[PDB]
Amino acid sequence: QLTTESMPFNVAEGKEVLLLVHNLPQQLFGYSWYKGERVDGNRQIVGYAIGTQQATPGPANSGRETIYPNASLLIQNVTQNDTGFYTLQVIKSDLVNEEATGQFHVY
Amino acid sequence: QLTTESMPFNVAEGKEVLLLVHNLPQQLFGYSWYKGERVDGNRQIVGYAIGTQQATPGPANSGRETIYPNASLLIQNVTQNDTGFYTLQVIKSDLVNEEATGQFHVY
Numbered sequence: 001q002l003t004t005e006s007m008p009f010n011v012a013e014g015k016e017v018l019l020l021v022h023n024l025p026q027q028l029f030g031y032s033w034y035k036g037e038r039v040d041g042n043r044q045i046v047g048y049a050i051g052t053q054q055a056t057p058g059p060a061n062s063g064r065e066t067i068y069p070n071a072s073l074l075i076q077n078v079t080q081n082d083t084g085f086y087t088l089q090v091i092k093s094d095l096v097n098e099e100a101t102g103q104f105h106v107y
Numbered sequence: 108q109l110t111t112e113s114m115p116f117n118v119a120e121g122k123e124v125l126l127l128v129h130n131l132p133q134q135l136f137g138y139s140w141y142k143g144e145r146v147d148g149n150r151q152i153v154g155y156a157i158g159t160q161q162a163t164p165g166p167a168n169s170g171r172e173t174i175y176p177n178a179s180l181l182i183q184n185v186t187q188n189d190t191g192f193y194t195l196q197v198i199k200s201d202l203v204n205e206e207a208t209g210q211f212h213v214y
């Protein structure tokens with residue numbers, strides 16, 4: 001089952017965190033990351049097209065994120081606003097989609 | 108600008124309803140319809156890839172829906188459970204996706 005977890009779980013303000021992703025389905029179009037516990041386009045961080053390996057910012061993009069080809073998400077110079085939940089949506093080639101939510105806590 | 112509306116807005120139990128879709132963006136991979144007001148994989152009705160013109164059922168699929176190449180969704184022999192909100196997610200080529208929510212009322 002698709003899952004995501006934060007390394008580290010508790011993050012000091014101004015440092016770094018990596019959202020690891022495990023168990024990606026086969027045959028994907030792309031990835032979309034969202035701030036919060038649900039898919040919500042108004043809160044999209046980034047969209048990643050696998051076919052072209054291209055990332056594109058959403059409205060929630062801070063400029064401090066970096067998504068990787070396996071959907072992992074790096075955030076640098078973490079701020080208070082970065083704290084809390086993140087939701088990854090994986091878009092499969094049949095447009096039937098899966099989500100996983102994770103969190104980390106800034107201090 | 109992406110919107111959806113029901114025809115008819117008030118629907119007799121056992122009849123038919125067409126969810127019309129307006130202002131699709133350019134450059135999309137496909138469509139994802141969900142029951143309710145938000146994107147939620149657990150409530151996904153159908154996924155549709157415009158390149159292959161293939162429909163695939165999600166967990167919320169009743170077997171009474173038909174999706175069209177312009178994302179329009181036909182529901183036949185409408186039940187009480189069908190009532191309420193539907194949400195369309197349009198998957199864009201850059202994976203920064205768009206949503207539109209509509210509804211109809213069964214009586």
Ligand SMILES: CCCCCCCCO[C@@H]1O[C@H](CO)[C@@H](O)[C@H](O)[C@H]1O
Pocket residue numbers: 018019020021022023068070072074
């Ligand atoms: C400094 C952070 C940049 C490094 C690139 C992040 C890529 C990490 O990605 C990780 O590769 C691991 C090895 O299999 C897997 O366990 C993980 O599922 C995956 O999340």
Ligand SMILES: CCCCCCCCO[C@@H]1O[C@H](CO)[C@@H](O)[C@H](O)[C@H]1O
Pocket residue numbers: 125126127128129130175177179181
């Ligand atoms: C009962 C069978 C009806 C099939 C409906 C086919 C889809 C119709 O769809 C509609 O076609 C119109 C012209 O493009 C547009 O006004 C609409 O945006 C569109 O939703």
